[PDB]
Each structure stands twice: as structure tokens, then as C-alpha cells.
Amino acid sequence: WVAIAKRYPEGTKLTGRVTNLTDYGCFVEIEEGVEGLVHVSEMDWTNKNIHPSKVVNVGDVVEVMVLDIDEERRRISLGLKQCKANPWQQFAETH
């Protein structure tokens, strides 16, 4: 069945780029008009991991796994947080 407004099965994973940090998570951006929230505990292996989130900065590319979707609001709540191999690149555009 469909959970009132659902696209993805849930627990199906995505890849996104990090944009903000919240009170108990991080916000990750997917595609245009589509953004997610990385829930801090969706891994376990962070806090005692030594790492600044394996260096999860604003404008870095990560992987996330989907939690709460509302097609009505356009919020998919995706949270993973491992990071990519070369997660920072030369982000300038006026060329």
C-alpha cells in the first residue's frame, strides 16, 4: 500500500550534498525542489568515530538513506552520512 504520500519504499538509499546543520541532525540536498534531513543517530558510528563526521561540511557530497516523505511538502527525510571519495571540489560558477 501507499503511506498517504510516498514515492520511494523507505530504507532505500540516496546520495545528496550537504547544505545546513540542525539542532539534532544535518540537512542534505538531493535534486532541485527535493531536500532531506540526516538524523544524527542514523549510523551509530559518529561521536566515538573521532572524525568531524568524516569531514561533513557545507557543500560536501554524502550518501543518505530515506526516512520520512511528504510529496505534499517535498521533504524526504534521508539520513546516512558516510561521505564521498573527493567530497569537496571547486564550487564556483560564473564562467
Side-chain angles (χ1 to χ4, degrees), residues 58-92:
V58 176
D60 96 297
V61 43
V62 238
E63 191 175 293
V64 278
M65 187 169 70
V66 168
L67 311 312
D68 211 61
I69 187 281
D70 214 51
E71 314 181 66
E72 300 189 296
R73 292 163 61 195
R74 308 189 71 187
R75 59 90 52 164
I76 326 306
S77 200
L78 50 269
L80 190 129
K81 227 181 182 178
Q82 174 184 269
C83 78
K84 187 60 179 297
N86 187 223
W88 183 262
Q89 56 178 252
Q90 208 193 260
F91 297 111

Side-chain angles (χ1 to χ4, degrees), residues 21-29 35-40 64-65 67-68 75-80:
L21 240 63
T22 208
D23 289 296
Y24 50 99
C26 156
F27 307 108
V28 157
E29 191 168 2
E35 51 180 63
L37 155 69
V38 184
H39 181 265
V40 50
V64 278
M65 187 169 70
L67 311 312
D68 211 61
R75 59 90 52 164
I76 326 306
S77 200
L78 50 269
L80 190 129

Side-chain angles (χ1 to χ4, degrees), residues 40-51 54 82:
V40 50
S41 199
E42 204 61 60
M43 169 179 280
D44 194 61
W45 194 43
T46 279
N47 286 274
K48 197 175 67 177
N49 180 252
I50 300 136
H51 310 305
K54 313 72 150 291
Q82 174 184 269

